[PDB]
Paper text:
Here, we present single-crystal X-ray structures of CheY from Pyrococcus horikoshii (PhCheY) in two different crystal forms, and the protein purification, crystallization and X-ray data collection of CheF (PhCheF). CheA autophosphorylates and subsequently donates the phosphate to CheY, yielding phosphorylated CheY. The concentration of CheY-P determines the switching frequency of the flagellum or archaellum, respectively. We observe PhCheY to have a domain-swapped, pseudo-dimeric fold, which may reflect inherent properties of the protein fold but is not likely to be of physiological relevance.
Author numbering:
A (entry chain A), B (entry chain A): 2 to 118
Write the structure that this text describes.
Amino acid sequence: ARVLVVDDAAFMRMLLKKILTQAGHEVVGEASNGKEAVEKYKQLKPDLVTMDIVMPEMDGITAVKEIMKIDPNAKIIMITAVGQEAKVMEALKSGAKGYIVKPFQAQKVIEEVNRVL
Amino acid sequence: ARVLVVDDAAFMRMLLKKILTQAGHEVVGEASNGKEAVEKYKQLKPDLVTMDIVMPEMDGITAVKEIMKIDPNAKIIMITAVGQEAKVMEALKSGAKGYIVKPFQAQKVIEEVNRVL
């Protein structure tokens, strides 16, 4: 009777939580995506999961492409950590204008925002 | 100076919003994933986007697989609409126990939760 509700739409989570709780079940957790669903399953060990078969599955690169398609003047800065450089490379190829590296130093972040503008 | 901040981690959004606002910039919106980033770009037409190159990119099927890997007794119900049947099929193959169809009738939803338990 302990249920993990997974859905990218907050209102869908709510609607399902309503129906479950109204049937005497306890929603012990919620997730907006795949990774979070799996993490929350470990931590909560629920009896039941409800999961939308559509989950956000758009990466940073293709979201750059979609935004550039909409507005070719879009100014995008990627947030990256060490190890993701191949993907950042391709984001920049696809129209992104810059990037900043985690962990942030506030000065370097604004140097880069300013540079882009 | 109007910035759309995109990152799957709420605290990362916050941290970046802090640094931007402290530099005299207006965070006019936020997104937790790819789809939402693109939608919000249209609606807000921001001067600047900041976007994590890692965005949730795990689909419902592979999140079923990861959960089954963790607990082979996991009980998962897929939420589906018309048109997604190929993906629901494969979710069930990978260990999911059932599904419910949107738009929900509360009775059919609990018939299916009960059946699974």
